[PDB]
Symmetry: D2
């Protein structure tokens, strides 16, 4: 709305009214996040905050952005994946006068340029003092290329498992320069978003990309962590015959008890570098493989060579290197079906026969498939994650780490989670949004199990 | 040969029990793997274990594993209805002291525990405790403190017993260190959840043979037991509603596809009949308590339940349901053992054709063990492999022999290391024929783990 | 009263307590008591009955009696009787000959005690049968008794097949109602009943964890559908075998892998034809077909060690148990549970690992190792039985002239309106509320507001 | 220079062709027929008027009929169900097709008329393929002289079969028909499992709403209501089911659903007082599946929970009283086929009003309107049956029979069970399933031929 506003780059500004209509619907689906908006708007806890944000530019992220703004923050925003932006969301945010650099279908060069447009304002570093990140890419660029900016930054609030792992590695190596909150490991994040979000959105993305029947076909899910658990359910509930691979025997035990057969792409689970260690009989019967690990090369070249003709290959982990797509680019001919859907023809590199039967279907070029081929998690799930983000931003901004003397800084340089009481308060708003009614303990009951009537209700060791 | 140091229902059930133990051994690869692994080393040689836990076939395989590793034991059940009499017979016939039968009275329950503590009228030379619920642990602390001086530790099975240990620790009255066996993931997220998934609808079917599909259930609680219990009923086609005091657990119930409700209007339990959601409770065909808390199916709830509803409890203790109110006010008609019709027409007599009754299972005691056989061998494999590792560790640590200054540093309630949790899990996975993938060194490097594990930080929730 | 034989008459009070509970679970059947008690439509009926002597059958028996009938009763399986139900029925002065654990010889003796009273044929005039055994004995050994019987009401798929074979052969002597193919029987009992009771029986017999293990269900008709769901809902990885490609299509769409014990599905009699890799991974095999030898000797030899074998079809020849009696050593675990040692015939090692577990000696496992279907499901089947008994009794086929008998000799089903009326009482038992069409809506879809709501061709 | 078509955008043809080639690999029964019959050309001389959703799946059906010798002229049977890339691919292949996504009612009627007429005169049609009966109705009302030369109708769906049986009852049906709907590989495949796949699909594409944990009411529990109820329950919705048929209601209970009525005691007397307001005020999503009229009526729409989603997956939009909503409430388009209906009044709305419903596809079939309908591997079964039905009626040549023989053949019939089984077998092989072959002894034991059929015609599966 601001006169003359040009400080953005999006696909199509004319999508803004549609984006705004969907933001208004989403607000009604996000009671925890809108509750925080209503509760804290008057107090303006983020007045003076200048937030660099790097997370999938969806309608759900739009509601998050406008909550931070309504609480007083200024922001400059980019997406954390080349294919995850909803162009109507980016348009509505830019049309509101909020700097955003994001569109569906960026090149890698454009992706990096978008992050840098958040970091730079008018050719010079913005006076940022907060960071909100999803996967650690903006965190990495600041530390690597703009270290002096971190001298003014009070904290990082990191959304996802892969990003937390990168923060923990930096902390252990002494290279993290500001404190962080691990938003991923709130229960109303990890055990909501990572699991139930993928349950909703994995089969959604496969249907939108291929319109394949899933019932009666064979799937292999690589990984059975939170995303693998949700992904396996997304497919089993459609009637797929789902097999699960894992390296963690505890997660494998859960998959067995959950009714899945646990298998390995490699004979006896051992990859010895050769095609002979591939279980070709197993891979020759798989119609769909989904990677969920956060690890590297878990659907490798030899597996891709052995998959059943016309199998679908996709990744719902944060980064595309779960699958060896580089091998497929090097060796096989790609036929675009429509955006983010490619047939990969195993007959050769140069041409392909339009009627060749020996191809695989790759979704979102191996990038996060739920966001690449559909719209990621639904608003009512992202509500939990993004309520935690707002609370984490408020906490670190109020702590003012950048203003402490060097001695006090060493003491607070940590990666922490939000306290369980706040996790419970977020969950309560989510439950109320379904119309659920939580029972209140009597005093005698709360004494009996050793809790306060108001919570928290579990020790910090509890796993849910 | 000359063995009389036991008390069971019927020793002639021993051959039957032995046949079922031999089957159970083939369903318990983690526990039988520990037998093979440690039999030559005899890590429990010299251990003298007081054991108090449901005297089932699965507990029989645990006992014989401890004995095969060198231990001597004296055993009792931790519930009056949970013993399988053929299991107790097989154990006694093997020359092992066991005092347990299905259908004990409260007095007999206490006498059975005392027969493990005392031998020939004097304290046994016990030096280890294995407990399920804390009753043996409490009796030792209140009545036999001199015995605790020589006891190296307690390995506690279940959530309720852990809570009691932590209360003693907080108050400075815990006298020996403990391992919380419950919170291994191969226990809590296997036994507590999947075991109740298997055995709740099992006990309900054996007790009543009621169709469950199409009927309305209310599960009180959505912890590990409440999660498994709700799945037990939902997979049968029940329409399951869930009650909770923990909004995070309630959030999971919502996302898992259940409607979350309270027995009380707006969830406020002010003690009045007016606070009961009578419309809701009048539609419930089955209520199951799963909390470990007190009076979560209270008298006013019982008064308002739909005629002929089934009432049962799968938490550790019967006081989850106000059965005392029912004993005081209503007439009980035994249908068969552990199945009572409770007639709400009054306390003195009943009409055999009265329609206004509830069906109570196991007099409100743990229903999976009271009306069926508790969890299956292949699930208990996980819990009891952890039990054996925990016994080995505390016995080898020899707390009772440490100087006072060193005892002060080791008096705690700990869990097993994650590496051992994973090793138990791998044996369970192999039992299903599952094939775990091995990380390459670069993949292990990439995610920050050793190739052999552990694979997750200790904060990980699974 | 001494005209009965049961395991233990002192179980009568227990059985009566369970009958009173069952009545509250059987609203369609108890509704028939209330509504026809005044008319006494079965006054003068003398019913020979042959069906599993369960608590559920007890409520059926007492409904027939409440409507005016006399009966003489036996079980249709050696292991399906609940001894407390038989005791209660006997204690009520009703002739019944049935106990759990009959021998084959005793089974036949029991049916004969219903046929005979004081050493001569009873003056029976109605037949209620489950599986066709009593029907067959009457035609083969007591043909003159059929001259006085107005009809047969047959419960189950196997019995109906046998009825149709006789009709086709011109050897059926009295008309019959196929109770099996009411929708409130076939698509309730055969399917949902096995869903409730198959996992129930396996748990009672073995207490095995089912989650995470591999099952093979042979067949995917109504029993195979319900059986597959019984196992899948427990977390088994279920594979389905079928000869009918339409049923196999349903299994695929329902989320199962469809496999054959034989390579390429071709059962040529050789061990070479067995898919040994498949069978060596199966922890549980369940037959559901009503066919012969669908779990055959070569399959049994190839099965994974310690697999469970059971049958939930009507007859035990679905599994080649005779081969196992001939060749392998049987170790009873407890009643209706046997370890079958594949090490040889004469003796076994108590600790041998190479055995299979057979439930109920291959007889119907849900009734043999548990209690069969639950009351609220059997409500549907047995309401249809009562209505079919009333319908045939009132038509008095035995009294017709020879010419009117030829036209009257058939196998029929009950009309759809009655099927719907049974269903309505079942729905109300769940507290369900059925909506009533407006006149305009009924006109729009071409039905009466009263129904029937579907053409006779509709498959639900 | 081919111009005998009308589609949204012919330049979508290449994209449509890529998707047809994928769909062929997902449709083994239909492509099996294409390969089996191509040499014989059993439809040589057939001239088929076709009216059915112009999807990619219909494209494979069309090209199978053409490959077997037929000529066709095609339109969609719903204003929102066409996939424009499918229509473009068919037109670019030289096949007359008049269809686009988003037709008006007038355009819909014009498209059917463009198949019926060629160069302004009746086409020399001799076969009809219909989905819902609209083309069949127009021919009987307006083009009887064309029906004299038509050999048969093959009708896809429950609603259209009902319309055929009404005509047969009334003595107004002019040519015989095959009820394709009631093949088991159609009714118990397409109607049920197709809606299982595509109902939650269309709701997600229209709204992106979380379904887990929310309350749904499914009106009806026939084949479509069974599949729809499962579509929502498998996502974690809490599903309640309404029915007028107590046998279908019994199935719903046994399947684990609570059976409820929108009306107190089930009595629909037309009053607001009759609405169970407590029930409707808890419902987040209502789906109609009945083929009936006004089963989501104005008084239910008034009582629904704020922001509930309303949609219909039966053939026609009159299942929901959208006319009432047009007359009384303000419509706000969110995006194509998604409207907020503001219950605050007719004259405009507050952009931030909280009291609205979300209507999908303006009440038209939601799986096709907001997504792509059933998937190829499911439509394989329905469309293999269509091809077989077309061959059968075309070979019978009803239009050339004498009057006395027509009278003996004027009927609505289903395909024989042996064909139903052979279609199913190709579908099972497409999954890699392995069907067992009976031994001679087993075939004798159950009284069937080793090759089938395996069930009596009375069998319900
Ligand atoms: N697409 C989404 O919307 C979304 C949502 C949340 C998280 N994520 C991403 O998904 C990834 C996984 O997240 P998570 O929370 O489930 O983490 P997690 O640690 O809970 O689970 C990852 C699992 O992969 C297993 N694994 C690792 N290497 C393997 C291998 N070679 N073979 C088989 N299994 C292997 C591990 O044992 C572990 O259980 C991360 O990149 C995370 O950032 C994506
Ligand atoms: N029967 C069995 O085989 C078996 C197995 C394992 C554990 N247990 C016992 O079951 C009980 C629960 O164990 P757990 O591991 O699930 O514990 P938990 O802490 O994981 O779960 C208990 C749940 O009850 C809830 N709760 C407490 N008070 C409540 C109230 N008034 N209304 C509603 N919900 C309420 C809590 O919020 C919690 O989520 C303990 O007694 C434990 O020892 C029994
Ligand atoms: N135990 C119970 O409570 C119970 C209940 C109802 C019926 N039954 C009995 O169960 C049996 C099946 O009854 P139903 O109603 O399902 O009959 P059905 O005709 O519906 O199903 C039997 C199925 O077996 C399949 N089949 C036959 N031979 C096969 C083979 N060699 N391999 C694989 N599949 C094969 C057929 O194709 C058919 O689909 C009958 O004997 C019936 O009397 C038992
Ligand atoms: N969208 C799709 O892809 C698709 C697919 C197949 C069929 N259809 C259409 O869907 C509709 C239903 O087809 P079907 O095969 O399920 O029909 P069906 O006859 O099998 O089921 C319709 C059901 O609606 C019930 N019903 C009727 N009026 C009712 C009312 N007022 N309240 C509640 N229930 C009521 C009937 O009792 C019946 O069980 C038809 O119009 C058909 O053409 C749509
Ligand atoms: N819709 C969404 N918006 C933002 N981040 C997401 N991560 C997963 N789904 C998402
Ligand atoms: N079968 C079993 N044996 C011992 N303890 C148990 N707790 C639950 N089930 C049990
Ligand atoms: K979304
Ligand atoms: K057990
Ligand atoms: K029963
Ligand atoms: K489609």
């Amino acid at each position: 709305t601001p006169a003359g506003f040009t400080d953005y780059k999006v696909a199509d500004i004319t999508l803004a009214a549609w984006g705004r209509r969907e933001l208004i619907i989403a607000e009604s689906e996000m009671p925890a996040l809108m509750g925080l908006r209503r509760k804290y708007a008057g107090q303006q806890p983020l007045k003076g905050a200048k937030i660099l944000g790097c997370i999938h530019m969806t309608i759900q992220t739009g509601v998050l952005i406008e909550t931070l703004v309504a609480l007083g923050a200024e922001v400059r925003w980019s997406s954390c994946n080349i294919f995850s932006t909803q162009d109507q969301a980016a348009a509505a945010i830019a049309a509101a006068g909020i700097p955003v650099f994001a569109w569906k279908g960026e090149t890698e060069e454009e992706y990096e340029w978008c992050i840098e447009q958040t970091i730079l304002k008018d050719g010079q570093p913005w006076d940022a003092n907060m960071v909100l990140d999803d996967g650690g890419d903006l965190t990495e660029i600041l530390h690597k290329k703009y270290p002096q900016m971190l001298e003014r930054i009070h904290g990082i609030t990191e959304e996802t498992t892969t990003g937390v792992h990168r923060l923990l590695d930096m902390l252990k190596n002494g290279t993290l320069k500001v404190p962080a909150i691990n938003v991923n490991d709130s229960v109303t994040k990890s055990k909501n978003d990572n699991k139930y979000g993928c349950r909703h959105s994995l089969n959604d993305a496969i249907k939108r990309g291929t319109d394949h029947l899933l019932s009666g076909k064979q799937a292999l899910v690589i990984g059975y962590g939170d995303v693998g658990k949700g992904s396996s359910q997304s497919l089993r509930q459609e009637g797929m015959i789902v097999k699960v691979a894992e390296v963690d025997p505890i997660c494998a035990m859960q998959a067995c008890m959950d009714g899945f057969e646990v298998v390995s792409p490699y004979k006896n689970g051992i990859n010895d570098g050769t095609e002979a260690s591939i279980d070709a009989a197993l891979l020759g019967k798989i119609d769909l493989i989904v990677t969920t690990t956060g690890n590297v090369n878990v659907c490798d070249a030899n597996m891709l060579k052995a998959l059943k003709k016309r199998a679908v290959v996709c990744n719902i982990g944060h980064f595309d290197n779960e699958i060896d797509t580089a091998f497929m680019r090097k060796n096989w001919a790609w036929e675009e079906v429509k955006p983010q859907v490619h047939k990969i023809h195993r007959t050769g590199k140069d041409g392909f026969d339009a009627h060749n039967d020996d191809y695989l279907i790759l979704l979102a070029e191996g990038r996060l498939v739920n966001l690449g081929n559909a719209t990621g998690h639904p608003s009512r799930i992202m509500d939990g994650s993004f309520a935690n983000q707002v609370l984490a931003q408020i906490h670190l901004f109020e702590q003012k780490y950048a203003d402490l003397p060097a001695a006090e800084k060493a003491k607070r340089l940590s990666v922490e989670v939000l306290p369980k009481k706040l996790d419970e308060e977020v969950a309560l708003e989510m439950v109320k949004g379904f119309g659920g009614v939580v029972t209140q303990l009597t005093p005698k009951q709360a004494e009996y199990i050793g809790v306060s009537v108001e919570g928290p209700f579990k020790p910090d060791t509890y796993r849910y």
